[PDB]
Amino acid sequence: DLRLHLLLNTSVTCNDGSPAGYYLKESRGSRRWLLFLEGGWYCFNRENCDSRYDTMRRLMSSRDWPRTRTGTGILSSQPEENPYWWNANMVFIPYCSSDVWSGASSKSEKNEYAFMGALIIQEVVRELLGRGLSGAKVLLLAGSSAGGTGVLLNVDRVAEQLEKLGYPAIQVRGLADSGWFLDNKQYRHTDCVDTITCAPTEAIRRGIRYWNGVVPERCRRQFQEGEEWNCFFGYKVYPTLRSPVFVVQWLFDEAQLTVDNVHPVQEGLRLYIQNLGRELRHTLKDVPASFAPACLSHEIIIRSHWTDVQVKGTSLPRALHCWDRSLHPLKGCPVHLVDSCPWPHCNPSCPT
């Protein structure tokens, strides 16, 4: 079990002003630290944030959090479940900011909600440096769904924070799971009039202004004022990053299909789905550390049976182990694994 600590700096808060926090399981004999960002959609105006507060309140508030959580998948301490990093120091950071981990705004006379995701990550790192992170050799910032996009937005800022604090020997790396989206042509189209009809490009542009959202500096300098939404798309922000980042992405991700307004398949939809897989494969062609199976699914790294899926005969825990070796090509230890077959479940190891 990982145990809850609420932040000592209580100005760093969840949406409703309650303190944010982290769950920790130490491993005294290890210099490896895994910090995992939870996912769970987002909200971008008063009315949809109000709805989320009634029926998704654990993603907006720490008031009802349990004192412990069990580590699963890459956060498990058992080698049977986690062949990759079972002996590491484990941290689970709950997502209670509803801002894709980008926000830098407090609740105030003008703001009903606080959007503090970017500041939550920096404050967790700061408090952990007094609980053993100061001795680290490797800090892996990982995350799923909105947390995977959060890795892309925040990994270089963690690297800069640790350098400025006097720890240039800690190697900062990222692992982004199910956070690599395309701003592609949708299968059916609606103008952005409400929550359900608003495509991601439009919803994120509004969200950035509502959250006071922040993006990595080199990407911000490329796209400039009013165009920061582009940095929430992995294939546009990734080439701007300096930290090593491993990208895990299903080729037919359920969340991508949802934002494309896709739910007996006829010719138009068949060609749409095949073109999506091809476009995703294209964006990953020159990403050297990546795992992209031809399955219809969503998230993987904290699933207990994450060991089962394989690309070209290599599992995800093996690929991440090969990545670690590459950062000390390797015979029989590949790091770039992207399926070529063109339809969901053409890989027999896909989740049922």
Ligand X SMILES: Cc1nc2ccccn2c1C(=O)NCC(C)C
**For ligand NAG, the closer CB: 12 or 280:** 12
Q: Which does 9 bind (CB under 5 to 8 A by kind): ligand NAG, ligand X, none?
A: ligand NAG
C-alpha separations of 188 from 204, 257, 276, 305 in Å:
19, 11, 14, 34
* Closest alpha carbon to 318 in 335, 295, 303, 304: 335
Q: How far apart are CA 184 and CA 13, in angstroms?
A: 34
**151 binds, options ligand X, ligand NAG, none, Cβ within 5 to 8 A by partner type:** none
Q: Which does 93 bind (CB under 5 to 8 A by kind): ligand X, ligand NAG, none?
A: none
φ/ψ (deg, to 5) at 115: -120, 95
Question: Per DSSP, what are the bridge partners of residue 291?
Answer: 248, 337
Does the annotation count 282 as an active-site position? no
- Nearest-angstrom CA–CA distance, 59 and 57: 5
Complex with ligand NAG: residue 125 or 287, whichever CB lies closer: 125
Could you tell me whether strands 68-69 and 89-93 are parallel, antiparallel, or unpaired per DSSP bridges? unpaired
Measured from the CB atom, is 27 or 122 closer to ligand NAG? 122
Q: Provide the minimum distance between the beta carbon of 134 and ligand X in the complex, in angstroms, as a whole number.
A: 32
Residue pair 316/85 in contact (Cβ under 8 Å)? The answer is no
- Say whether 16 is catalytic: no
Contacts of 190 (CB under 8 A, 6+ apart): 196, 197, 199, 261
What is the number of the residue whose Cβ is closest to ligand NAG?
9
In the complex, minimum distance from the CB of residue 200 to ligand X, in angstroms, rounded to a whole number: 4
Concerning whether 134 is annotated as a catalytic residue, the answer is no
Minimum CB distance to ligand X smaller for 51 or for 258: 258
Interface with ligand X (CB under 6 A): 41-42, 100, 145-146, 149, 181, 200, 204, 232-233, 255, 258-259
Which listed residue (97, 98, 144, 298) is catalytic? 298
Smallest separation, CB 133 to ligand X (Å): 27
Name the site residues for ligand NAG (rule: CB under 6 A).
Answer: 9, 11-12, 119, 123
Please report, in angstroms and rounded to a whole number, the separation of the first and last CA atoms in the chain: 28
Whole-number minimum distance, CB 38 to ligand X, in Å? Answer: 11
Catalytic residues: 145, 253, 298
